[PDB]
Design a protein around this ligand. Structure first.
Ligand code: HEM
Ligand SMILES: C#Cc1cc(C[C@@H]2NC(=O)[C@H](Cc3ccc(O)cc3)NC2=O)ccc1O
Length: 393
């Protein structure tokens, strides 16, 4: 037999039995990625946290020429160090502040947009596609608002994402075409006097501030493209798969409909059980480091399997059950951990909370319109998502 291949399954509605078997018997295990490279797959909560909390397991170094790769780059190699570049430019605080969900009127905008999307689906009649006509447009509209760019520019930027977030063995020519075009768009935004709000409005001001005069225009444009793309793909994909998990749990759906104050705790559990990340998080060892029974050597690739940690019964007893009263509810790894913890975690929570609150009010009887096995799971992609999510109500 050949070496165990990753990823195990593109399905986002069930965890393969193999994960629990590996976690119990071999919580760090050698695997082969789609490029042919070997890697260490880490699948227990304890070892996943160890890797993510030790910066000697480096994100930046995964982009080095000649390294064992999980997948091909879809961005320039320096962009793998995006957050380090933002920090070096003195822009970290400003970027973080721009992407919080607490800007005046943002939550009301999210609620209004979700309600409008849902009203259009109700008018059109069942079946409705909750990914393409709800979750993704809601994510796109949210990120246009947060960036300060026109809502009407959302769809074309969104169209890049089915390629930008591919998990491919080989470089993708279309990724460069779209990247270069989206960079040109964001560079134009920085020069557009109408853009005075949100992240791009703030970056546009800082760009002309003497304390930032040697920050490159390339970096300012890259922040726009990367935060739009990572935010939209991550929130749209998470909400989509969370809606599946909610629909498949009518008792919980009814509880959250009846007691909406429990939605934040429900979203935290939906984050914990979420299978949206299709691959382990990659890191390259910069030293020889003991992880469990394995001495990982300098230059080797490690893959941190988020659902390995998040379904680990030693940390989350009865891991497959959504329980709203856990004592460690935010200790999951859905947003990562350590140096590269998601900078948009609060916005991602609020997007899902508001989307779910709106859906349960407008469509309390929501259910799948097709048997669950009929969902078509996107392959060779950095997220697990159904191509369509047909529902009735
Ligand atoms: C529920 C929605 C989201 C989930 C589940 C999610 C998940 C994650 C995870 C697991 C990481 C860590 C990757 C790693 O360590 O290798 C990450 C990083 C990142 N996230 Fe999020 N996220 C979400 C929402 C957002 C939003 C709304 C934004 C921005 C608007 C965003 C922007 C980013 C960026 C830029 C990084 C890279 C941080 C870095 O390189 O250091 N994410 N996200
Ligand atoms: C979430 C996440 C996430 C983070 C990273 C780490 C890192 N940091 C970054 O900011 C961007 C995100 C990105 C990738 C492709 C695009 O077209 C646009 C943005 N690239 C990076 O390599 C990688 C993949 C992700 O999925």
């Amino acid at each position: 037999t050949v070496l165990l291949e990753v990823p195990f399954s593109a399905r986002g509605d069930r965890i393969p039995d193999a994960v629990a078997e590996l976690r119990t018997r071999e919580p760090i295990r050698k695997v082969r990625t789609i490029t042919g490279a070997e890697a260490w797959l880490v699948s227990s909560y304890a070892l996943c946290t160890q890797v993510l909390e030790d910066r000697r397991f480096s994100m930046k170094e995964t982009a080095a020429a000649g390294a064992p790769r999980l997948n091909a780059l879809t961005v320039p190699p320096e962009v793998v160090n995006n957050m380090g570049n933002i920090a070096d430019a003195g822009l970290r605080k400003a970027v973080m502040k721009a992407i919080t969900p607490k800007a005046p009127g943002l939550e009301q905008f999210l609620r209004d947009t979700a309600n409008s999307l849902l009203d259009n689906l109700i008018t059109e009649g069942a079946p409705a596609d909750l990914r393409n006509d709800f979750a993704d447009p809601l994510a796109t509209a949210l990120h246009c608002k947060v960036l300060g760019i026109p809502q009407e520019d959302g769809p074309k930027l969104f169209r890049s994402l089915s390629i930008a977030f591919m998990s491919s063995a080989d470089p993708i020519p279309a990724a460069k075409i779209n990247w270069d075009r989206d960079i040109e768009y964001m560079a134009g935004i920085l020069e557009n006097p109408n853009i005075t709000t949100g992240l791009m409005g703030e970056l546009s001001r800082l760009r002309k501030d003497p304390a930032y005069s040697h920050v490159s225009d390339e970096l300012f444009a890259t922040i726009g493209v990367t935060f739009f793309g990572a935010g939209v793909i991550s929130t749209g994909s998470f909400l989509t798969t969370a809606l599946i998990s909610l629909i498949q749990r009518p008792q919980l759906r009814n509880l959250l409909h009846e007691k909406p104050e429990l939605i934040p705790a429900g979203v935290e559990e939906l984050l914990r059980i979420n299978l949206s990340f299709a691959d382990g998080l990659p890191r390259l060892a910069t030293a020889d480091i003991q992880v469990g029974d394995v001495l990982v050597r300098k230059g080797e690739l490690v893959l941190v399997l988020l659902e390995g940690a998040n379904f680990d019964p030693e940390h989350f007893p009865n891991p497959g059950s959504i329980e709203l009263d856990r004592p460690n509810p935010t200790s999951h790894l859905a947003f990562g951990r350590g140096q590269h913890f998601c900078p948009g975690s609060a916005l991602g929570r609020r997007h899902a909370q508001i989307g779910i609150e709106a859906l349960l009010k407008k469509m309390p009887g929501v259910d799948l319109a097709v048997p669950i096995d009929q969902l078509v799971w996107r392959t060779r992609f950095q997220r697990r998502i159904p191509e369509r999510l047909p529902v009735l109500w």
